[PDB]
Structure formats: C-alpha cells, structure tokens
Amino acid sequence: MLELFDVSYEELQTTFSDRLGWEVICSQGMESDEFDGPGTRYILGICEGQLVCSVRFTSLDRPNMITHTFQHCFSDVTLPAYGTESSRFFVDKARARALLGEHYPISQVLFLAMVNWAQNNAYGNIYTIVSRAMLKILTRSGWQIKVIKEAFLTEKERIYLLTLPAGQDDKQQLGGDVVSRTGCPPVAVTTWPLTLPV
C-alpha cells in the first residue's frame, strides 16, 4: 500500500527494517535550503520503505519562496497574515512506476493529500509558485487552481503564484478522480493520513 502522511522538521531531526527504511527515505529526499527548519512540515508518500513523493509546507508568516527567493517577482501581491506555502513538490516517477505500477496517478494522489492535510490544519487554500510546466499539469488535473500572478523568472521562463483550493468540493473532486482511476475503496480518499491500496 501507499502511505501519505505528514512529518515535522523537528521529527525529522529529533528522530530493524524501521531505522533502515527511514534512512533510505531520508537519502531519497530533496536537499535542504534556507527554509527547512522548525515550523516546516512535509507530506511524505511512502511504499515499501521508499519515498515516492513529497511536498513541503511553510507558514506564510515565516521566510518562504514567495516573500524571499522570488520577492522581486511578487512583491506587489499582498498575502494573508495566516496561511501556508507549498514548495519542493516531488514525485519520483521512475520509482513510483516500479512500486505502484505504471499509470498509477501518484501526482493526483499527492494533490489529494495536500487538500486533506490542509483541512486537517485549518488552511482553506494553499499558496505556491510553480513553473509553466507544472501549471499545465495542475490545470489538466481538474483542481480549480487560481493564478494570482504570472511572472517572468527570465526572458523565456515564466513562473506563477497560485492559490490551490482545499475546500470540501476540492477534496471530493480530487478524491473522486483518484477513486475512479484506481478503484480504491471510496472511504480511502476521505482520511488524513491517507492509506491507499496499490
């Protein structure tokens, strides 16, 4: 099965096949940057002791990619006092194929996990900066994302500040898509953490 749950930076620091699996997971993760610290949280997608996907959440009131890294691109945008930014979206397509089989909608499942996690954490939406390629993916996912601002990273590189909705309609929308694509039990997409049969 595929387990999607969240862990804190502190848990990743403060802490047989268990220790080993955890070490393999850590060795497969995204290398740190200025924002990995107390307060930061991560959703991990794990199967058979291996990391198939992950995404990082940072509070909007703490240093993040919108306010720091890409400050010059979005400084005209006013952000809410309370909120979360998702970054470092990660899906190992090669490894997911091996463990979850080809055609498993691992990306849609992580989107669902983000919504389910957000509801469990009192966030009605998630802010994020994505590449043009990722914007195309999100747009095709059906998730009713909203572009707040399109920016030019470079002359030919466009990036976008978006809000990702995490309301009940979104949870049912993403959940319904996952159910019909994997045939998993309907109740499996309604919880947090998530446990999906593969």
Curated annotation (Swiss-Prot):
Function text: Required for the synthesis of OHHL (N-(3-oxohexanoyl)-L-homoserine lactone), an autoinducer molecule which binds to EsaR. OHHL is necessary for biosynthesis of EPS virulence factor (extracellular heteropolysaccharide) which plays a role in the development of Stewart's wilt on sweet corn.
Family per record: Belongs to the autoinducer synthase family.
Species per Swiss-Prot/TrEMBL record: Pantoea stewartii subsp. stewartii
Pfam families assigned: Autoind_synth
UniProt-listed GO biological process terms: quorum sensing; signal transduction
Domain of life: Bacteria
GO function terms (MF aspect): N-acyl homoserine lactone synthase activity
Reactions that this protein is recorded to catalyse: a fatty acyl-[ACP] + S-adenosyl-L-methionine = an N-acyl-L-homoserine lactone + S-methyl-5'-thioadenosine + holo-[ACP] + H(+)
EC number: 2.3.1.184
Name of the protein in its database record: Acyl-homoserine-lactone synthase
Keywords, sorted A to Z: Autoinducer synthesis, Quorum sensing, S-adenosyl-L-methionine, Transferase, Virulence
Statement: the UniProt record of this protein carries the keyword Ribonucleoprotein: no
